[PDB]
């Protein structure tokens, strides 16, 4: 190929890979907060009714 | 080049990175080049700047392009059928509905003011739901327009059968609009009336024979109540028992009896059938012409929603970053498409490939090969930069 | 080799660096560089 083509195709390539990692990583951590909050409430809620 | 041309303008939708510069005019501006240089300045440029959307991951991205191609082609086809249903109805004859308003704004004027429509399609929603919503709307609308045009064609067929029954050709026809209390007697049961469908030659032959066909045939009843080109339609009154002898005797002479009595319910129901059939075709046709026109606009807004989406996502796949692109809709005057397409390829082609590039022109549609179809779901011939060709 | 090159070029719109090197029935090697995911 041409030098210009190959560097343009390398700069595109890693941009997708970093981007795929950011986008997946956001979903994991966005769900990890919903999970934190829920599970903390559940553990209390079960037990506060027992103390009652 | 064309695919359903009337007098509609043809459009090329292009998108580029914001670092791109033409090589055909070095150091020139992209926006200026499109209006000024491009096919001798007879190029009319309109805005068509598509917003950012929620782009998936890398694996999901392949699957997003595959579906945009398919859905695009469906909507494009389906609209082609709607135009046809109109063309046949004579609601599109010289020109109509390819330049006609699209919510009170003509088709070329509408594309320039088209930038994304926030009618129900949101940018706080996912890409996936945008493809599913738009495509569902497009399919569903086509199916209702198709169901009414089928029903209308059936309805014409019933009416046509009915008019001929009410007068035309005798072979199934019994008259019901030319009744009279004395040319058609049945009030007790002694007398009845038999009608005889007689060829024209045979008209004299009937006037002579009518009395002899059976015994107890009423005098001077034989008169032509109705007449058509092939046949003359007679009434004769006679006694009910004798109707069997009469009919058989009629068929030897080489007449054809048509049996109709003057029962009240008979006369009324045949008459009704003519009327009910005209009223069904009538109501339907008015709703059906209205329904297609209303469908036409909706599937138009929806076709462009996919293309805008399609082009955007593709741009992301081919150039990479920036996610901010310089996007235009260029109105080409009819038959300058091939010359326009080539000029764009020379300038901008280097960006998407310095070896993956060849000269090309126009748009040819085929099922001979899959090459030259410019799509990301089937193998085609790779374009050197993102360019999609719209034929109206 | 050519029909696999054309099918992968029509599947991945661009987005590949396809080579071939003849192995020395006759056969051939290939390198693709599928730049990304979800089509692997």
* Residue among B203, B325, B183 nearest B260 (CA): B183
Dist CA C13 CA B23 (whole Å): 24
> B223 preceded by cis ω (within 30°)?
no
**Coil, helix or strand at residue B389:** strand
* Residue among B114, B58, B83, B91 nearest B304 (CA): B114
Q: Please give the interface size between B and C, counted as residue pairs whose CB atoms are below 8 Å apart.
A: 45
Dist CA B117 CA B138 (whole Å): 16
| Cβ pair A23:B56 closer than 8 A | yes
The tokens describing C39, both together, are 């089509």
- Asked if residue B169 lies in contact with residue B160, where contact means CB atoms within 8 angstroms, the answer is no
Question: Which of C12, C33, C36, C40 to mutate: most A Cβ within 10 Å?
Answer: C36
Backbone φ and ψ of B270, nearest 5°? -65, -40
Q: What is the CA radius of gyration of chain A?
A: 23
Residue that the structure tokens 């064609």 belong to: B153
| Cβ pair C35:A6 closer than 8 A | no
> Which is it for the CA torsion B283, B288, B291, B293, positive or negative?
negative
| Cβ pair B57:A19 closer than 8 A | yes
Domains of chain B: 5-49+323-392 (3.30.70.1180), 50-171+262-322 (1.20.1460.10), 172-261 (3.30.70.100)
Whether the CB of A36 is below 8 Å from some CB of chain B: the reply is no
In DSSP terms, which residues pair with C30 in a beta bridge?
C20
Dist CA B213 CA B222 (whole Å): 12
> Mapped to the 3 state alphabet, what secondary structure does B228-288 carry?
CCCEEEEEEEEECCCHHHHHHHHHHHCCEEECCCCCHHHHHHHHHHHHHHHHHHHHHHHHH
Dist CA B69 CA B378 (whole Å): 9
The CA–CA distances, whole Å, from B323 to B22, B307, B375, B376 equal: 20, 17, 21, 20
The CA–CA distances, whole Å, from B67 to B140, B309, B378 equal: 18, 11, 11
Whether the CB of A18 is below 8 Å from some CB of chain B: the reply is no
Dist CA B226 CA B166 (whole Å): 11
Residues 6+ apart with CB under 8 A from B299: B75, B78, B79, B82, B137, B138, B141, B142
Closest residue on chain C to B354 (Cα):
C14
| Cβ pair C14:B353 closer than 8 A | yes
The tokens describing B340, both together, are 């326009």
- Helix (H) or strand (E) run with residue B17 in it: strand B10-17
Helices A3-51/B58-89 angle, 10° precision: 100
Chain B residues close to C13, C-beta within 8 Å = 65, 314, 317-318, 376, 382
β-strand B231-239 against B387-390: which pairing, if any? unpaired
Experimental method for this entry?
A: cryo-EM
Chain C residues close to B57, C-beta within 8 Å = 37-38
The CA–CA distances, whole Å, from B246 to A28, B40, B170, B205, B273 equal: 94, 87, 19, 15, 29
| Cβ pair B57:A12 closer than 8 A | no
Burial class (CB in 10 A: 0-12, 13-18, 19+), A25: exposed
**Coil, helix or strand at residue B227:** strand
End-to-end alpha carbon distance in chain C: 18
The CA–CA distances, whole Å, from B348 to B219, B343, C14 equal: 97, 9, 16
**Coil, helix or strand at residue B364:** coil
Dist CA B361 CA B336 (whole Å): 10
Which residue stretches of chain B are H helix? 30-36, 58-89, 107-112, 127-166, 203-209, 243-253, 264-319, 337-348
Dist CA B288 CA B147 (whole Å): 9
Chain B residues close to C10, C-beta within 8 Å = 370, 378-380, 382
Q: Enumerate neighbours of C (3 or more CB pairs within 8 A).
A: A, B
Whether the CB of B321 is below 8 Å from some CB of chain A: the reply is yes
The last residues before gaps in chain C (C-N over 2.5 Å) are 24
Residues 6+ apart with CB under 8 A from B28: B21, B22, B37
Dist CA B109 CA B101 (whole Å): 9
Question: A37 to chain B, minimum CA–CA distance in Å?
Answer: 24
Dist CA B213 CA B221 (whole Å): 13
> Which is it for the CA torsion B41, B46, B52, B54, positive or negative?
negative
């Amino acid at each position: 190929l041409t030098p210009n083509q190959v560097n343009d195709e390398l700069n595109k390539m890693q941009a997708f890979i970093r981007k795929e990692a950011e986008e997946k990583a956001k979903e994991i951590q966005l769900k990890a907060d919903q999970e934190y909050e829920i599970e903390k409430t559940n553990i209390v809620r079960n037990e506060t009714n027992n103390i009652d | 080049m064309a695919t359903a041309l009337y007098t509609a303008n043809d459009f090329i939708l292009i998108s580029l990175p914001q670092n791109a510069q033409p090589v055909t005019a070095p150091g020139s501006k992209t926006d200026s080049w499109f209006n000024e240089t491009l096919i001798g300045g007879r190029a009319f440029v309109s805005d068509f700047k598509i917003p950012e959307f929620k782009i998936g991951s890398l694996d999901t991205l392949i699957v997003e392009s595959e579906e945009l191609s398919k859905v695009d082609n469906q909507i494009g086809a389906s609209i082609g059928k709607i135009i046809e249903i109109l063309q046949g109805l004579n609601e599109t004859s010289t020109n109509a509905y390819r330049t006609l308003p699209i919510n009170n704004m003509p088709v070329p004027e509408y594309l320039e003011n088209f930038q994304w429509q926030t009618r129900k399609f949101k940018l706080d929603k996912s890409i996936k739901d945008l493809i599913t919503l738009i495509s569902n709307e497009s399919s569903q609308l086509d199916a209702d327009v198709r169901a009414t045009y089928a029903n209308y064609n059936s309805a014409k067929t019933n009416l046509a059968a009915a008019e001929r029954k009410k007068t035309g050709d005798l072979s199934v026809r019994s008259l019901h609009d030319i009744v009279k209390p004395e040319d058609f007697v049945l009030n007790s049961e002694h007398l009845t009336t038999v009608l005889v469908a007689v060829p024209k030659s045979l008209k004299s032959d009937f006037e002579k024979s009518y009395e002899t066909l059976s015994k107890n045939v009423v005098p001077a009843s034989a008169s032509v109540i109705a007449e058509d080109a092939e046949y003359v339609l007679f009434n004769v009154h006679l006694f009910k028992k004798n109707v069997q002898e009469f009919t058989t005797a009629a068929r030897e002479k080489k007449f054809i009896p048509r049996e109709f009595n003057y029962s009240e319910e008979l006369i009324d129901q045949l008459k009704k059938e003519h009327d009910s059939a005209a009223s069904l075709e009538q109501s339907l046709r008015v709703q059906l012409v209205r329904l297609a026109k209303t469908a036409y606009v909706d599937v138009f807004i929806n076709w462009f929603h996919i293309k805008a989406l399609r082009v955007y996502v593709e741009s992301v796949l081919r150039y990479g970053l920036p996610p901010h692109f310089n996007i235009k809709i260029i109105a080409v005057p009819p038959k300058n498409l091939s010359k326009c397409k080539s000029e764009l390829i020379d300038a901008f082609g280097f960006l998407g490939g310095n070896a993956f590039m060849k000269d090309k022109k126009g748009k040819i549609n085929k099922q001979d090969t899959s090459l030259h179809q410019y799509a990301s779901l089937v193998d085609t011939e790779y374009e050197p930069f993102v360019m999609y060709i719209i034929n109206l | 080799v050519d029909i696999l090159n054309r099918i992968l070029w029509r599947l991945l719109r661009g987005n590949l660096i396809f080579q071939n090197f003849p192995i020395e029935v006759e056969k051939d090697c290939f390198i693709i560089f599928t730049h990304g995911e979800t089509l692997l």
